[PDB]
Write a protein that binds this ligand. Structure first.
Ligand SMILES: [Zn+2]
Lengths: 83, 141, 177, 117, 49, 76, 94
RNA sequence: GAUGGAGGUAGAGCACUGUUUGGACUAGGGGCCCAUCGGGUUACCGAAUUCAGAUAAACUCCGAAUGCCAUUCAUUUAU
RNA sequence: GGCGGUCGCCUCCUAAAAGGUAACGGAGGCGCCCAAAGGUUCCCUCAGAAUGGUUGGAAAUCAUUCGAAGAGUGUAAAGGC
RNA sequence: UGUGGUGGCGAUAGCGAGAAGGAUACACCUGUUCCCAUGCCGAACACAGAAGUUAAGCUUCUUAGCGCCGAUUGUAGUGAAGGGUUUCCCUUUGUGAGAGUAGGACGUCGCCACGC
């Protein structure tokens, strides 16, 4: 680490609509809101909308949409009409 | 006037040779081969005519390798030019053959075809040729 | 950081199991991370690194270097001494901070996601993760970033084969497919 | 990834340095050795290769820790044992290192206590 | 573009040395600290004019 | 009408003092062009790689293993 | 098996030029049993075994006693005459 | 006559530069792929790659006979 | 003889393994550049090839591995490093 | 004895492939406040120490796949002396390579400290 040639950085709290994953750092700062012990006396300005759970991939693939029923189209729309 | 073989040179005027003697270079691949027994050059054409007169009285191909190739270049002046100024233009090619060397080699046909062809060929070269076969080893392979 | 904790408390015993090292020293680690922002346009317009290096300083925590030209190419119009690319190396805790960023916030900001390609083995395990854009990280803003450059993350390990590295990175994020 | 075995590079720099002067006729050589924990020294001659006086970081007699303390101590011991046999024209072999105190403090300790560079 | 040039002592006024430069790389008179023989002491030398 | 027949002068390289000879201080030994014979005991190299002697004495050529050769002067 | 094997001279002078005009082959043997001694041979003797046996059978040298099982290694003969020169032998054990 | 040395000649040799003839192969290209993914097919071949076999004045991993330079050396001779 | 070409300097070959050696013999360059491309004291090792990786192209920057030299040396060629 | 340091001798000492080890020693490693450092980066270099470990380096041992050193022979070539065609060849006399190859070889010698 040299001097005067490295930008700002602080252990800014990360957060989201859930999960309070308040441990990481960053380089964007501002209005102080979380000076707390359990984490860094820092900022939750990072209110990213991805918990690493929004995209159901780290929470595993969900059934968020289907997008599954093409066969019943002929087999239910006039297939309810069938039987 | 047909061009059998040539090269890519890197040099044009080469000092004319000096041929002394040789021994070795026995049969390599085929079963029947020539053997020049003198000291002389050999032009491009002579080898070409030899290859033709071997192919024709052969048939169905039969393995035939041309175990020599012109490398060195040639030169000449024009008639009516007094001696003097720098070397003349280059025209031709030549690869000198000492005695003992082996020019051609064949296999794939019984001797009668072989000696037929390899006596037809030896009338196109200024060398006193001979005839030898692929002889013997500790392992023929 | 939390990773180092999680690392020395979970990764070491699990991996010591899955291969039975005669010594814990035999562990496959993570060594460094290098970042590669190739402008490729300074020869045309040298007024692009002027912002590339800035966006970098924002992504990492340090100002990048500036790689030279090293040779001369006409179809490219390359003369030696010209700058084309700018890099940073990550070590120490910042490694883990930035990798936490990647696995936890950065990666899941990319549209139409399936995960990382399963094939960056190199037969020696230094997996890379190409990126198209640079609008991903929250350290970057809409009306301030006016290009679509990319980087080439080159993570390195101490593994010899690729399965060790794969199932290691599995323990440390890397949402594969 | 491999790691370059650090003693090798210092060996190489040593071999380049040594190429300037050993000259250990009657103005015999000095020496130096690092480690993770200790420091050693000998006063050597050529062509014999037979040293004349030695010392030891933590093998004979010292006070402090692996630093100038140990360094200066060893240097004092070297210079004392040297003038015993009457040597005042040593040629200092840098080894393959620099001057920053584990070698430099050793050096100047060797100077004052009675050896001439 | 190159020119044979003569340095000269800034104190004793002796044209002591001779050398050459590129009159468009370095368009300023040179200043080197050569050694004068007339007084046996280093002396700021300046290009002739 | 040629464009040849251009030549330089000779420069007369080649050793100028054999072995077992008694050489006085200063003499030349083996005029080179680039290093072909590394110098040795009391032998010094000049600007154009020539090899002179520093002390009076006797010459002997030897070899440095596989690399190259040497000259040196062992005074009496 | 009971052959024409005898002695020779170290570096004999142009006595060799005539050795090639009167039917002689300067031959050699160096190997395991006994170290190295130049040794006679000509062209008609061994071709008997060659035709009878072939091209690699165990060849034995004699002073009418124990044998040297030579395994003749290389002989690239002087061309333009089709006759043997420089027969480089070799000898191994069982 | 004896001993020590400098140097790349006549050989001959493919380790480098050139020149080069066959065998194998795939590196995959060669007009299509054969086709509106299974192998790119017939064919061309260089290198990646190899197995043999050739040649040089401005090619050398090597290299004599001779001359040449020296010696508090020896024997005859006489410059 | 003329008409053509050449007239000084450096490198290779011819040159017959000390040095020297012609030809209107076979091949190339020179009539400068550099205030650092010098002096000194520290430190470092190349061309490639394979394998991965946005724009990226067969060929830019990167990363890993193999690599005695196949690089580089202001300028022509030998000899060196 | 072993281990560390430090020199000579043509790589016959090397390359490659495989096993063993940690008392001391060496090294890996724990860190940056401190002299010192990064054309960004305690990786390098420099400093502060001993949590942990022989996985690696590292030293000991095995191996003729590769790299090297190779005799005695034969053959090419040649000084001197001759003889034929004089493009070339041949014979006495003195010397005699390169290729090929038996074989050797997984070092030898010297010093200083430590303790078992
Ligand atoms: Zn003055």
């Amino acid at each position: 680490m040299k001097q005067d040639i490295h930008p700002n950085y602080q252990p800014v709290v990360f957060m989201d609509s859930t999960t309070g994953f308040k441990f990481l750092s960053g380089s964007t700062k501002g209005s102080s809101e979380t000076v707390e012990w359990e984490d860094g006396n820092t900022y939750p300005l990072l209110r990213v909308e991805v918990t690493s759970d929004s995209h159901p991939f780290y929470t595993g693939r969900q059934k968020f949409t289907q997008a599954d029923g093409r066969v019943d189209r002929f087999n239910k729309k006039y297939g309810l009409k069938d039987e | 006037m047909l061009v059998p073989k040539r090269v890519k040179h890197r040099r044009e005027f080469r000092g004319k040779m000096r041929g002394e003697a040789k021994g070795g270079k026995e049969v390599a691949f085929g079963e029947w081969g020539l053997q020049a027994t003198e000291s002389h050059w050999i032009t491009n054409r002579q080898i070409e005519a030899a290859r033709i007169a071997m192919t024709r009285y052969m048939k169905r191909g039969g393995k035939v390798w041309i175990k020599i190739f012109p490398h060195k270049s040639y030169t000449s002046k024009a008639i009516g030019v007094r001696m003097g100024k720098g070397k003349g233009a280059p025209e031709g090619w030549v690869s000198p053959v000492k005695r003992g060397k082996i020019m051609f080699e064949i296999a794939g046909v019984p001797e009668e075809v072989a000696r037929e062809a390899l006596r037809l060929a030896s009338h196109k070269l200024p060398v006193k040729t001979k005839i030898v076969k692929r002889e013997e080893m500790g392992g023929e392979s | 950081n939390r990773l180092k904790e999680k690392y020395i408390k979970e990764v070491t015993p699990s991996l010591v199991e899955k291969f039975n090292y005669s010594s814990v020293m035999q562990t496959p680690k993570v060594d460094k991370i290098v970042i590669n922002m190739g402008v490729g346009d300074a020869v045309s317009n040298a007024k692009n690194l002027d912002k590339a290096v800035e966006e970098l300083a924002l992504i990492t925590g340090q100002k990048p270097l500036i790689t030279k030209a090293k040779k001369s190419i006409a179809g490219f119009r390359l003369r030696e001494g010209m700058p084309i690319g700018a890099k940073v190396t990550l070590r120490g805790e910042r490694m883990y901070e930035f990798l936490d960023k990647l696995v936890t916030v950065s990666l899941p900001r990319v549209r139409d996601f399936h995960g990382v390609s399963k094939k960056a083995f190199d037969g020696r395990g230094n997996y890379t993760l190409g990126i198209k854009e640079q609008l991903i990280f929250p350290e970057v803003d809409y009306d301030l970033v006016d290009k679509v450059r990319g980087m080439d993350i080159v993570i390195v390990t101490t593994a010899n084969t690729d399965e060790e590295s794969r199932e290691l990175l599995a323990q440390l994020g890397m949402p594969f497919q | 990834i491999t790691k370059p075995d650090k003693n090798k590079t210092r060996q190489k720099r040593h071999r380049r340095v040594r190429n300037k002067i050993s000259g250990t006729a009657e103005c015999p050589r000095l020496n130096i050795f690092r480690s993770n924990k200790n420091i050693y020294a000998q006063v050597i001659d050529d062509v014999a290769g037979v040293t004349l006086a030695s010392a030891s970081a933590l093998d004979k007699e010292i006070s402090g820790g692996t630093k100038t303390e140990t360094a200066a101590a060893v240097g004092k011991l070297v210079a004392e044992r040297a003038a015993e046999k009457g040597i005042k024209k040593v040629v200092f072999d840098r080894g393959g290192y620099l001057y920053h105190g584990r070698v430099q403090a050793l050096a100047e300790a060797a100077r004052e206590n009675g050896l001439e560079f | 573009m190159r020119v044979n040039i003569t340095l000269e002592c800034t104190s004793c006024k002796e044209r002591n040395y001779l050398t050459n430069k590129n009159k468009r790389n370095n368009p300023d008179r040179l200043e080197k600290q050569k050694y004068c023989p007339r007084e046996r002491k280093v002396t700021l030398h300046r290009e002739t004019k | 009408s040629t464009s040849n027949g251009r030549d330089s002068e000779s420069k007369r390289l080649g050793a100028k003092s054999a072995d077992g000879q008694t050489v006085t201080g200063g003499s030349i030994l083996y005029r080179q062009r680039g290093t072909k014979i590394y110098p040795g005991v009391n032998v010094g190299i000049g600007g154009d790689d020539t090899l002179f002697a520093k002390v009076d004495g006797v010459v002997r050529f030897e070899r440095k293993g596989r690399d190259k050769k040497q000259v040196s002067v062992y005074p009496v | 098996v009971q052959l024409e094997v005898k002695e020779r001279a170290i570096r004999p002078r142009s006595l060799r030029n005539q050795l090639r005009h009167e039917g002689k082959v300067p031959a050699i043997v160096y190997g395991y049993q006994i170290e190295s001694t130049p040794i006679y041979f000509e062209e008609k003797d061994l071709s008997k075994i060659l035709r009878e046996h072939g091209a690699n059978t165990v060849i034995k040298m004699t002073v009418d006693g124990k044998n040297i099982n030579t395994l003749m290694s290389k002989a690239q003969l002087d061309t333009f005459t089709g006759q043997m020169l420089h027969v480089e032998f070799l000898s191994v054990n069982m």
